[PDB]
Design an enzyme around this catalytic site. Sequence first.
Site, PDB file in Angstrom:
ATOM      1  N   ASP A 232     -10.055 -13.067  81.460  1.00 16.80           N
ATOM      2  CA  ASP A 232     -10.730 -14.343  81.692  1.00 16.80           C
ATOM      3  C   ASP A 232     -10.027 -15.398  81.074  1.00 16.80           C
ATOM      4  O   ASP A 232     -10.660 -16.444  80.548  1.00 16.80           O
ATOM      5  CB  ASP A 232     -12.122 -14.211  81.344  1.00 16.80           C
ATOM      6  CG  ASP A 232     -13.067 -13.072  82.226  1.00 16.80           C
ATOM      7  OD1 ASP A 232     -12.525 -12.659  83.276  1.00 16.80           O
ATOM      8  OD2 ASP A 232     -13.718 -12.658  81.478  1.00 16.80           O
TER       9      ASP A 232
ATOM     10  N   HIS B 214     -14.796 -18.720  86.091  1.00 16.56           N
ATOM     11  CA  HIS B 214     -15.231 -17.663  85.419  1.00 16.56           C
ATOM     12  C   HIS B 214     -14.268 -16.706  85.042  1.00 16.56           C
ATOM     13  O   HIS B 214     -14.511 -15.589  84.566  1.00 16.56           O
ATOM     14  CB  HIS B 214     -16.536 -16.680  86.531  1.00 16.56           C
ATOM     15  CG  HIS B 214     -15.714 -15.784  87.153  1.00 16.56           C
ATOM     16  ND1 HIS B 214     -16.380 -14.537  87.612  1.00 16.56           N
ATOM     17  CD2 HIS B 214     -14.652 -15.810  87.911  1.00 16.56           C
ATOM     18  CE1 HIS B 214     -15.783 -13.755  88.301  1.00 16.56           C
ATOM     19  NE2 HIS B 214     -14.473 -14.459  88.728  1.00 16.56           N
TER      20      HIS B 214
ATOM     21  N   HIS C 179     -11.298  -7.714  82.022  1.00 20.34           N
ATOM     22  CA  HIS C 179     -10.443  -8.800  82.312  1.00 20.34           C
ATOM     23  C   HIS C 179     -10.327  -9.535  80.946  1.00 20.34           C
ATOM     24  O   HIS C 179     -11.227  -9.341  80.176  1.00 20.34           O
ATOM     25  CB  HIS C 179     -11.118  -9.489  83.599  1.00 20.34           C
ATOM     26  CG  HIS C 179     -11.612  -8.716  84.552  1.00 20.34           C
ATOM     27  ND1 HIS C 179     -12.978  -8.481  84.399  1.00 20.34           N
ATOM     28  CD2 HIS C 179     -11.456  -8.541  85.600  1.00 20.34           C
ATOM     29  CE1 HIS C 179     -13.424  -7.903  85.403  1.00 20.34           C
ATOM     30  NE2 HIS C 179     -12.423  -7.806  86.146  1.00 20.34           N
TER      31      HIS C 179
ATOM     32  N   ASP D 123     -19.145  -8.819  79.130  1.00 23.28           N
ATOM     33  CA  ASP D 123     -18.907  -8.977  80.387  1.00 23.28           C
ATOM     34  C   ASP D 123     -19.577  -7.596  80.790  1.00 23.28           C
ATOM     35  O   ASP D 123     -18.847  -6.530  80.642  1.00 23.28           O
ATOM     36  CB  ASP D 123     -17.526  -9.053  80.882  1.00 23.28           C
ATOM     37  CG  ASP D 123     -17.547  -9.357  82.344  1.00 23.28           C
ATOM     38  OD1 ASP D 123     -18.181  -8.744  83.063  1.00 23.28           O
ATOM     39  OD2 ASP D 123     -16.736 -10.269  82.865  1.00 23.28           O
TER      40      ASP D 123
HETATM   41 MN   LIG Z   1     -15.364 -11.970  82.193  1.00 21.71          MN
HETATM   42 MN   LIG Z   2     -14.657  -9.512  83.998  1.00 24.08          MN
END
Ligand SMILES: [Mn+2]
Ligand SMILES: [Mn+2]
Lengths: 314, 314, 314
Positions: B123, B136, B121, B227
């Site tokens: 984010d 998050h 992602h 991540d």
């Molecule tokens: Mn993340």
């Molecule tokens: Mn992620």
Amino acid sequence: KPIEIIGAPFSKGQPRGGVEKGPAALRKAGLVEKLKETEYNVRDHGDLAFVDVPNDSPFQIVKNPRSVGKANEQLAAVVAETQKNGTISVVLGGDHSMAIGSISGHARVHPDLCVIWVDAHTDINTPLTTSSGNLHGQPVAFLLKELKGKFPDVPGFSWVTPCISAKDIVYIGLRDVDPGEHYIIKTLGIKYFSMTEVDKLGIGKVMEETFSYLLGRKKRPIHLSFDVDGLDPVFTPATGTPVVGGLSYREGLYITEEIYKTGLLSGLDIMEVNPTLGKTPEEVTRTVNTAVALTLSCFGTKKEGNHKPETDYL
Amino acid sequence: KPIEIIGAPFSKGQPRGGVEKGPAALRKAGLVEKLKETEYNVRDHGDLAFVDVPNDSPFQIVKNPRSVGKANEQLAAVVAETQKNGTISVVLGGDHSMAIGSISGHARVHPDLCVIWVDAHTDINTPLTTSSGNLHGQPVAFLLKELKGKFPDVPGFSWVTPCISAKDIVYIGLRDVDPGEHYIIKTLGIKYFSMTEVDKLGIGKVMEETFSYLLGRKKRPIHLSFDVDGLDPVFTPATGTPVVGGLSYREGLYITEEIYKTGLLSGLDIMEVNPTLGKTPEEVTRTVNTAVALTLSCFGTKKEGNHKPETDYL
Amino acid sequence: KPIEIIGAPFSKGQPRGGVEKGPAALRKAGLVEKLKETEYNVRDHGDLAFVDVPNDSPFQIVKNPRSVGKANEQLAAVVAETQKNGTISVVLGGDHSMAIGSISGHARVHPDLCVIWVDAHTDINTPLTTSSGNLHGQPVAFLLKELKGKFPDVPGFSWVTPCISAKDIVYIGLRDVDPGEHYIIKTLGIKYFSMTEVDKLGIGKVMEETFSYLLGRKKRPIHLSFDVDGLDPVFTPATGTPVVGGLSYREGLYITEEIYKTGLLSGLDIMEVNPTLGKTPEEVTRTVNTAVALTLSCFGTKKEGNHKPETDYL
Ligand SMILES: [Mn+2]
Ligand SMILES: [Mn+2]
Ligand SMILES: [Mn+2]
Ligand SMILES: [Mn+2]
Ligand SMILES: [Mn+2]
Ligand SMILES: [Mn+2]
């Protein structure tokens, strides 16, 4: 040219147990009858019989010194012999320690040979540097010239004669190298492609270099010592030294595949296949089968298909 | 140089539950004692204690605004502090929302730092664009300059000061980008390597560009925000945002591995490791262990082996 | 441009059973409503109704000859028809044998079209060379010019008119090619990228060549015949012909992904998705979903994210 299959049900290189059941599990899986179907001639020399040297006291750390020494002495003989009669030697392990005899014998009949070592480990630890005394992790040492004298003399390995130098061997797969082992290989400047190299280059490129590096000048025979644990445990789960993030099935085949195309395969070792080490039958099956796969690959089976020459299927 | 491990048992960025048990599961897995064995000095600063802002009404969509704001305020402080004393900061999540404080603190002591964000992602969703109000998934937004003002002010995040611009960060892994997020990143022309890029180039090449792009001119510190969900679920299964077709173990290590070699690792984040999210113990184990792996990689463990300098193992 | 989804619940190409439940499982998985959300127009033409030719005696080896012939006759019609109205044709299998009608129909309206065949197999075995009489393994043969006459005439396939030559098709994935099939493809010099090629080059490079090879000169339409078994069984487990060491999810998407970017996708086939063939619901789910994935990929979903044009999400 012809093929000669030699069993090597040995397991005193590794402290575990079950690898001697290796050749049998391979055979079982149709390894021969399969090899048979390739454009090579096949002969199963059987599984050498090993005499367990009674009372094999640990020569310091090194365990089962003589048991292994004698084991390899026999093999190097059988290997050398059939190599002499121009048949390509295929050894079914058994633990990687048996490598010594396989290469040694080979060296005799073909001393200019080079070595392609596929494994997560270097197995180049000396009787001194090993953290265990497990010989299945010291093969390259006994065979190495540069490491001659660089360590005491183990009982039973008196017959070994360092038959190759660091410019004759190439590693592929490495991802678990002991401080010593690392030192040794970085010191003797030995060419290799640890997973990082492979990740950076791609199996394809890696083979190119591997080949031009070892065959650029002279086109010598090739000795492929394939340690099953070299592929991710996701394909070769049944081994004593599983390491994450290793050669994929596809990569592994590509190697054996390219090496087939070189037409220089002189000697082969299918090691560490340990049947007893399987969370499920599947695993053990899976392993063996890729084991067999690699093997046939080395001998012409191509992912791109196969047909018999001079035959119109139409 | 020295290392400073900072726990961040936080989970209000994600709506799920269990990530706060992350740092603990990591520690548990030997993360420190392991790090200890590298050529870095280690100090475990412990796990910040978070005070749950009682009555944290959702600021519109954004949920647990103040709870998170205060959480990150503390962290950015502890981080900034230990960064000041020249120790490399390693934060153990906890969800990715904690990223804000980790980077913020860091920015203070090292404002010229750049960011390597590894994640499936971006984010980078703003309080407005999020489809959930889960912070998050909004980290990059609060830290981004270009996104300053581009959205209301969330309670508790008053202290944040956009500390980096789109030419200071690089994504790697992306494969699940929201329409908004996409828009935002394509609009601000942020450099990244989504799985398609990686597939096209190969982790190796990707790192090259990633490095010359972020360090071509000035050799600034590097802030690695990793991540866990960035690797295929097949290695990092225990997370709240699993996405198929992600970085392999080998790729993931190569990254951390190359970043180690740059010698510019200033800050690190090990996030989204959610122990409770495991179909089997294995999964949860597997995850954590690679988590630990990546971490040590960043700090010198090399797939190609490791030995101690000025020491003849012979 | 618009899309036309055509069901092809057929299973007489394969001896097994369940593939006809394919289109349904795909639809079920949201395939349409999903496709709907792309910047293409969508229309579900439904699933052709197939009339089972009563008393379909095996024409030699070839089984269910007429049943299949008539099946494909209908499809080639529906396909040709909607292709005529300039809508991109998407066929949901059903076994790969239905390929014949899909391509045939297409050829009619777009005879200069080229074919990108993704599959572990060539499915180019002739009624003579097949070791089974399963037509789901002979598609390319009936469509091939070069193979015209090179075999007897099967009942029901009287309508087929070899519509493409070996310089119009490219294989990708191959890893299980029959001796005959191999011979045939090596003889007619058909361009392909078996797993070995892919391993050597990298999906990326492979696509490049695949594209310049088939579109270097003329920019003709592209007919993508995607056999689900082309991806490793680890993603597309629910099929009748699973083969190890195949295209990864990421590779598979990259292909469909690149082909999307060519803007030349004219025809598509999503085959061999056999719901009944799943060790667990998961598998069957997993498969279908990637199936759907590939499909959307072909139509613009990008791993790198997606946003709607002329729309400020800010
Ligand atoms: Mn993340
Ligand atoms: Mn992620
Ligand atoms: Mn070994
Ligand atoms: Mn090994
Ligand atoms: Mn097929
Ligand atoms: Mn197939």
